[model samples]
Target: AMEEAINATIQRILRTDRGITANQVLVDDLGFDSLKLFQLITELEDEFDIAISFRDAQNIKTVGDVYTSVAVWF
Candidate 1:
């Protein structure tokens, strides 16, 4: 439930209606470079009132992966 929430949040950030998918690659396919990724992360942090460390940021690979990780933190 939490994961889905974060995914939906991300979907809103990128302005994409595709929603959440484990298959949705974050960088290669989503057009999210490092800059955009961090920007989105900042949005997510503000949206959910959560914090993510820079070192832990690398674990995010896909939309689902990010959702899953953020879920636990929240």
Candidate 2:
């Protein structure tokens, strides 16, 4: 349920209508560079009122990874 919302936000930030699946790679599928990835992370943090450490950020590689990252906080 929460993952759906996170996916929606991710699509919005990525400006894409394509379905974002769990396996979708941040760079390969979504074309996110390091700068944009951090921008997206910042937006996600503010949207969900969550704090992600550098290590946590480093571990995120896919859409599902992001869901896992923020889901625990909520």
Candidate 3:
């Protein structure tokens, strides 16, 4: 359930899909600039009502990383 929701949210932000997988790089694959990434981070924080620190942000590189980070809050 969590995976599907996050995946869809990311895909929706990207505005298209080409096999978004756990290993997909959010920046490279999605062509996401810092603004886009931060937008996603903001939305996720708002949706989950959890805080993600900048230090923790460094650990996220791929889509799965984001899911893992957010899932930990729940």
Candidate 4:
């Protein structure tokens, strides 16, 4: 559930033309400048009612990573 939330939320954000979730390799492929990352993180925090930062989110790139991280919150 949490992994799906994360993935879907990311995809949704991308579909918003936010320039995120583009390339699989480069960080820039996500199309998030530092400010944009922060804003997105802020929005995500509100959505989940949790605190998260770009650095923390960046650490989560894989499905396993998303599951592991969100499971801790759950």
Candidate 5:
């Protein structure tokens, strides 16, 4: 599912041992800077074989947001 995949991707990028919950803010909670966020977008694109646009990327604020953004493509 997208949620599982999205969480996995976030975990990979953050390299965090802690769990990634849906409500966790990407930047504030998980320390995602612009570069890391970009890397996440790229990784997710490759993982899901979908294009995440700049506008879509902009809308992502939390881990759940990532799932919401990519769900449309699936």
Candidate 6:
């Protein structure tokens, strides 16, 4: 459930329906620029009703990284 929601949020942000995998790198694999990266963090915070610190946001590299960061809240 968490993975699905995270993937959905990512797909929405990128405006792409391409399937996202846990190993996919947000920038290299999914084409996320700095703007998109910020949007992603904002959206995830809104979606999960959680706060992501700057350090946490900076450390996220892959889809799985995002999942791991947000999963702690759930």
Q: Which one is best on lDDT? A: 6
How many clashes in each candidate?
Answer: 0, 0, 0, 0, 0, 0
Candidate 1: the clashing residue pairs are none
The true-versus-predicted C-alpha distance at residue 22 of model 6, in Å, is 0.5
- TM, every model: 0.76, 0.89, 0.87, 0.52, 0.91, 0.97
- TM-score quality measure for candidate 2: 0.89
In terms of lDDT, the poorest run of 10 residues in model 6 is 40-49
lDDT of 5 at 65: 86
lDDT of 5 by residue, 4-63 (tens): 778888888888878888899999999999999999999999998999889989989998
Model 4 lDDT per residue over 6-60, tens place: 6566666555534323234323455545555455466557777877555668875
Order the candidates by TM-score, highest first.
6, 5, 2, 3, 1, 4
Candidate 1: regions farther than 4 A off: none
The top-ranked prediction according to TM-score is 6
Tens digit of per-residue lDDT, candidate 6, span 1-74: 99999999999999999999999999999999999999999998988899999999999999999999999998
Compared with the true structure, model 6 gives a TM-score of: 0.97
Candidate 6: misplaced stretches above 4 Å?
none
Local error of candidate 3 at residue 63 (angstroms): 0.7
The order by descending lDDT is 6, 5, 2, 3, 1, 4
lDDT (tens digit, per residue) of candidate 2 on 1-74: 78878878877777888888889999998888898789878988888888899998998999889988988887
The predictions' CA RMSDs to the true structure, in order, are 1.9, 1.1, 1.3, 4.6, 1.0, 0.6
Itemize residue pairs with steric clashes in candidate 6: none
Q: Model 2, residue 51: what's the lDDT? A: 86
lDDT for 16 in candidate 1 is: 82
**What TM-score, to 2 decimals, does candidate 5 have?**
0.91
Superposed model 4: Cα runs more than 4 Å off:
16-31, 53-69
